Amino acid sequence: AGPVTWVMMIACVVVFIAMQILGDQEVMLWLAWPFDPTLKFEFWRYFTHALMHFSLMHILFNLLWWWYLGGAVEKRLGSGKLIVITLISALLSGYVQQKFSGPWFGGLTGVVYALMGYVWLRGERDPQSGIYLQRGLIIFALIWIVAGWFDLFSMANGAHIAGLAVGLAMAFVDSLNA
Numbered sequence: 001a002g003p004v005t006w007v008m009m010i011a012c013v014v015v016f017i018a019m020q021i022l023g024d025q026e027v028m029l030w031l032a033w034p035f036d037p038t039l040k041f042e043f044w045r046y047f048t049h050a051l052m053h054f055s056l057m058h059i060l061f062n063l064l065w066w067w068y069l070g071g072a073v074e075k076r077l078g079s080g081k082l083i084v085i086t087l088i089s090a091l092l093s094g095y096v097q098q099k100f101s102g103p104w105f106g107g108l109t110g111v112v113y114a115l116m117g118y119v120w121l122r123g124e125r126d127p128q129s130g131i132y133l134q135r136g137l138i139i140f141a142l143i144w145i146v147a148g149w150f151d152l153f154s155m156a157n158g159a160h161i162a163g164l165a166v167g168l169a170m171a172f173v174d175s176l177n178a
């Protein structure tokens with residue numbers, strides 16, 4: 001795994017520990033999507049919501065998926081590709097989530113949906129890229145998708161589909177250019 005892959009993991013782990021020590025609220029005051037007009041130009045907040053997780057299962061599986069999928073993108077396609085997928089999917093998934101239920105949300109789930117769509121489709125359309133989602137892992141991706149869809153580890157399905165759409169779109173275009 002490359003530097004973007006690892007720095008994200010470090011960030012999420014430190015933030016999660018901080019949320020346990022300080023409480024979710026205090027950390028959200030710093031990192032959440034802007035929740036007051038006076039914060040609308042704190043432009044990092046359109047992305048930093050992605051760094052907060054709300055349970056052990058939430059962060060554990062997100063970081064496993066991020067490490068595998070994000071790591072593959074970074075290794076084969078470069079840090080830049082990973083950064084763009086991450087920023088765009090975080091921004092769009094965050095935007096959709098906040099429109100539906102307000103600014104108090106967080107985590108990498110939307111980004112992971114984008115990376116799943118990206119790695120799966122790029123691998124299927126463009127095997128030469130060296131990127132692919134192994135069939136064994138497709139099994140677990142579907143389990144993880146269905147479980148989250150029914151809120152077993154709420155009400156964020158639309159935002160997640162928005163993330164998936166970003167990944168599928170980028171993979172499609174990238175496979176044409178490649």
Ligand SMILES: CCCCCCCCCCCCCC(=O)OC[C@H](COP(=O)([O-])OCC[N+](C)(C)C)OC(=O)CCCCCCCCCCCCC
Nearest residue numbers: 057061064065067068069134136137140141143144147153
């Ligand atoms: C909570 C419900 C949702 C569960 C979601 C689970 C998500 C797990 C994602 C892990 C991603 C990182 C894994 C990774 O990046 O690793 C890469 C490497 C692949 O192996 P390889 O390419 O060398 O070939 C294998 C040799 N072969 C082809 C002959 C078999 O190692 C591996 O993938 C090791 C495989 C990891 C399997 C872990 C399964 C844990 C499921 C527990 C929960 C079940 C619910 C009840």
